[PDB]
């Protein structure tokens, strides 16, 4: 099949930098080629169109070129609001394809750096009567990327973890992250303490409650 | 000139489902129409197509799994024998080319939702979030247990924005969704309003530190 191979699936690049984006057909497709941004939540935005034709109103700090069997996107003077999902597509047939469009670009923009702001939540009496206990961290406004380490009386927990991280902030570059440890009531009820380290380069940032004082 | 899907719901294995692309202010007769879907946190995968002149493309994979319709002002998407594989934003978008000019997928519709489950769909337990028992705080609500997505999760009735925390949902092993959102405020009733459209609910849940 006609085949798109976009490359690399993830870059990232500083705030006024350049990023550039690598689109090959397995056949020669004759210019008939878009560029597409998008964000969660939305629909895919038309930015380059003939290869190398900006849409209606996209800024020419977007720039594609390219023929035959070889596309590339580059962005010039990536700002925050740039940090988004890009994808190649052709247009040249819709015979014998098994997708128009490419695997895609994550493009994260490395803004001003921020310390994490770090919550923990003990489960509240109506979940510990279910059975099941679901103990949340967060970590609020922050880049670069952080890790999580959750601690049971000193012990690292390796299961029951759940992390789910927002976009980055299309204004300042920064995250948001929730971090979830589910026990069963009975597992919870087995121990004390209960920590949530959330660590940055080297430096580490740490949440903890008692059961008992709950 | 716009674009709008619907038909979009949770489904079981195996029943066929139809999608409906309604299109305004520009000529089927012009514009190519397509059907593309987006897993949750995955790539666009193109499904196919209905040109002008009526002629109907689909994908490899896609061939006898969907098949594509018109009349002058809708575009149809029929899913033969939905799997879970199908679960997926469905997304329509019109192109056209001149001379040798391809001018891409202009415009898309906001796109509708297929969740392709045998479980049957159920709303939102939710739970709050308050510190361990500085003069401002940040309270939450985890909201967890639901079928099919979306639910909205508001603070005082979309009163309360500033400092508002949502995050992205997460599967669960069990097939259900969770989500959870946190709000700062200035310690002054604090309440969260979980509405989850396809079970046709809304949970208050008032939050005490």
């Known amino acids: 099949a006609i085949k798109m191979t976009q490359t690399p699936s993830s870059v990232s690049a500083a705030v006024g930098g350049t990023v550039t984006i690598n689109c090959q057909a397995s056949?020669?497709?004759?210019?008939?080629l878009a560029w597409y941004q998008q964000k969660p939540g939305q629909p895919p935005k038309l930015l380059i169109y003939?290869?190398?034709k900006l849409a209606s109103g996209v800024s020419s700090r977007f720039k594609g070129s390219g023929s035959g069997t070889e596309y590339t996107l580059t962005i010039s003077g990536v700002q925050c609001d740039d940090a988004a999902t890009y994808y190649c597509?052709?247009?040249?047939?819709?015979?014998?394809?098994?997708?128009?469009f490419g695997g895609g670009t994550e493009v994260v923009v490395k803004g001003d750096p921020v310390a994490p702001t770090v919550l923990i939540f003990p489960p509240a009496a109506d979940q510990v009567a279910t059975g099941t206990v679901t103990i949340v961290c967060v970590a609020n406004k922050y880049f670069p990327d952080v890790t999580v380490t959750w601690e049971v009386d000193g012990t690292t927990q390796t299961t029951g973890i759940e992390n789910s991280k927002t976009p980055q902030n299309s204004a300042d570059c920064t995250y948001n992250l929730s971090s979830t440890l589910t026990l069963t009531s009975t597992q919870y009820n087995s121990h004390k303490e209960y920590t949530c380290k959330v660590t940055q380069g080297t430096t580490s940032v740490v949440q903890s409650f008692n059961r008992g004082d709950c | 000139q716009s674009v709008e899907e619907s038909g979009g719901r949770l489904v079981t294995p195996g029943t066929p489902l139809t999608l409906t692309c309604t299109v305004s202010?520009?000529?089927?007769?012009?514009?190519?129409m397509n059907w593309v879907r987006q897993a949750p946190g995955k790539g666009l995968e193109w499904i196919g197509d209905?040109?002008?002149?009526?002629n109907t493309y689909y994908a490899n994979w896609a061939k006898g799994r969907f098949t594509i319709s018109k009349t002058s002002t809708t575009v149809d998407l029929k899913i033969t024998s939905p799997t879970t594989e199908d679960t997926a934003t469905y997304f329509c978008?019109?192109?056209?080319?001149?001379?040798?000019?391809?001018?891409?997928?202009?415009?898309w519709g906001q796109g509708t939702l297929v969740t392709v489950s045998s479980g049957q769909p159920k709303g939102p337990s939710v739970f709050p979030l308050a510190p361990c028992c500085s003069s401002t705080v940040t309270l939450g609500c985890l909201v967890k247990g639901y079928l099919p997505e979306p639910v909205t999760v508001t603070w005082n009735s979309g009163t309360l924005t500033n400092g508002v925390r949502t995050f992205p949902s997460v599967r669960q092993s069990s097939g259900l969704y969770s989500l959870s959102s946190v709000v700062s405020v200035t310690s002054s009733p604090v309440t969260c309003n979980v509405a989850h459209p396809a079970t046709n609910t809304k949970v208050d849940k008032t939050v005490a530190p």
């Open positions: 978008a019109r192109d056209s080319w001149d001379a040798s000019s391809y001018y891409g997928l202009d415009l």
């Open positions: 202010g520009f000529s089927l007769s012009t514009y190519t």
């Open positions: 209905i040109y002008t002149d009526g």
């Open positions: 056949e020669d497709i004759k210019r008939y």
């Open positions: 003939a290869a190398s």
């Open positions: 597509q052709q247009g040249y047939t819709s015979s014998n394809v098994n997708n128009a």
